[PDB]
Amino acid sequence: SMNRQEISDLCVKSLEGRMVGTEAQNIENGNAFYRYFFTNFPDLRVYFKGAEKYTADDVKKSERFDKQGQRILLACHLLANVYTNEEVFKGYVRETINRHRIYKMDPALWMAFFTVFTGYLESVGSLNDQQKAAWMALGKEFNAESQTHLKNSNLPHV
Amino acid sequence: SMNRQEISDLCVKSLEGRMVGTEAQNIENGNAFYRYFFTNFPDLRVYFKGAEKYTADDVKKSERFDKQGQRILLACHLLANVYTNEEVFKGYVRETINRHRIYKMDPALWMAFFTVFTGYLESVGSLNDQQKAAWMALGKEFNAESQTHLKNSNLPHV
Ligand code: HEM
Numbered sequence: 001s002m003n004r005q006e007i008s009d010l011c012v013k014s015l016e017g018r019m020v021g022t023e024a025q026n027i028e029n030g031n032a033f034y035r036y037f038f039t040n041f042p043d044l045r046v047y048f049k050g051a052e053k054y055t056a057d058d059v060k061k062s063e064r065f066d067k068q069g070q071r072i073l074l075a076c077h078l079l080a081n082v083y084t085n086e087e088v089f090k091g092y093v094r095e096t097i098n099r100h101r102i103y104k105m106d107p108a109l110w111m112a113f114f115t116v117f118t119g120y121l122e123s124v125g126s127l128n129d130q131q132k133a134a135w136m137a138l139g140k141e142f143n144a145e146s147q148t149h150l151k152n153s154n155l156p157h158v
Numbered sequence: 159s160m161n162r163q164e165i166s167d168l169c170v171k172s173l174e175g176r177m178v179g180t181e182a183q184n185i186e187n188g189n190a191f192y193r194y195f196f197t198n199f200p201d202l203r204v205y206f207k208g209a210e211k212y213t214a215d216d217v218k219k220s221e222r223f224d225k226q227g228q229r230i231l232l233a234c235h236l237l238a239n240v241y242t243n244e245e246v247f248k249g250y251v252r253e254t255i256n257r258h259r260i261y262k263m264d265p266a267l268w269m270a271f272f273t274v275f276t277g278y279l280e281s282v283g284s285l286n287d288q289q290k291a292a293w294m295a296l297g298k299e300f301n302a303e304s305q306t307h308l309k310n311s312n313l314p315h316v
Pocket residue numbers: 044047048049064068071072075076079096099100103105109110112113
């Protein structure tokens with residue numbers, strides 16, 4: 001239904017209120033993702049060494065999560081902004097998977113991430129039907145390349 | 159003179175013949191960057207631990223440089239494809255600088271990189287005047303954010 005440009009446009013528009021940067025608000029845009037993630041998906045804290053028992057307040061006051069918040073937020077901005085360019089998008093997916101090899105994640109989490117992230121964006125404001133659908137379309141492609149890459153890399157996959 | 163979109167368009171067009179991917183040609187697109195880099199800038203090999211004395215043939219036959227070739231090539235595709243979005247672009251610059259802290263690079267190299275890279279693109283084909291100018295404009299902005307970020311981070315800078 002939607003072409004790549006429209007998906008990119010919708011995903012980019014949905015992030016205008018969650019922009020990366022160096023000011024207090026930008027740091028909050030990233031930190032709040034982890035507060036949402038740790039509150040609503042506490043079973044996934046296990047992957048974050050030393051932070052397995054962190055509460056939202058622990059995350060709020062953690063420089064580790066200020067910095068990591070910016071990294072994941074940046075990653076999602078990159079996905080949104082390069083989606084139109086399918087080969088670059090797929091390159092970035094593979095590189096993300098490579099960089100997560102160390103965490104030994106259940107590979108079914110690659111799709112689940114997009115539920116966390118859209119839920120977060122409902123964790124601060126309006127995410128209209130089209131924008132959520134765009135993220136789920138992007139997520140579907142992210143996951144398809146992730147599982148292909150995992151299989152090609154002799155790693156566990158779904 | 160050029161707006162951000164035109165710079166992005168020119169930088170993206172210049173990379174169509176150097177696309178990331180998983181086929182032999184795509185791996186070559188990345189490996190060849192390091193063969194060019196190591197041949198023409200041998201004084202910079204010092205940063206690559208274990209590869210300080212590598213020749214082009216050593217790079218050609220190195221899985222390390224096949225993989226690293228894809229990483230730098232991907233990075234330059236990301237710069238080109240997100241340039242229009244200034245805040246995302248600057249976020250990616252800062253993250254690149256952060257990830258290079260370990261190498262203790264002379265900070266004047268951030269600008270120099272763009273000479274290596276445009277020289278490489280003259281290392282396989284036509285880079286017209288507009289496209290080279292676009293890379294130098296992008297490089298100027300990359301460097302400006304790099305030095306600002308280094309200074310803000312209490313790190314050596316120019
Ligand atoms: C539910 C799925 C995921 C889990 C459980 C997960 C887990 C992790 C963990 C544990 C870290 C290290 C953070 C720390 O210890 O402070 C990390 C880093 C990171 N993750 Fe994820 N991750 C997931 C999905 C993703 C996705 C989909 C992306 C890209 C859109 C991503 C991008 C990053 C980035 C950019 C970093 C910083 C280190 C790096 O550059 O690789 N993650 N992740």
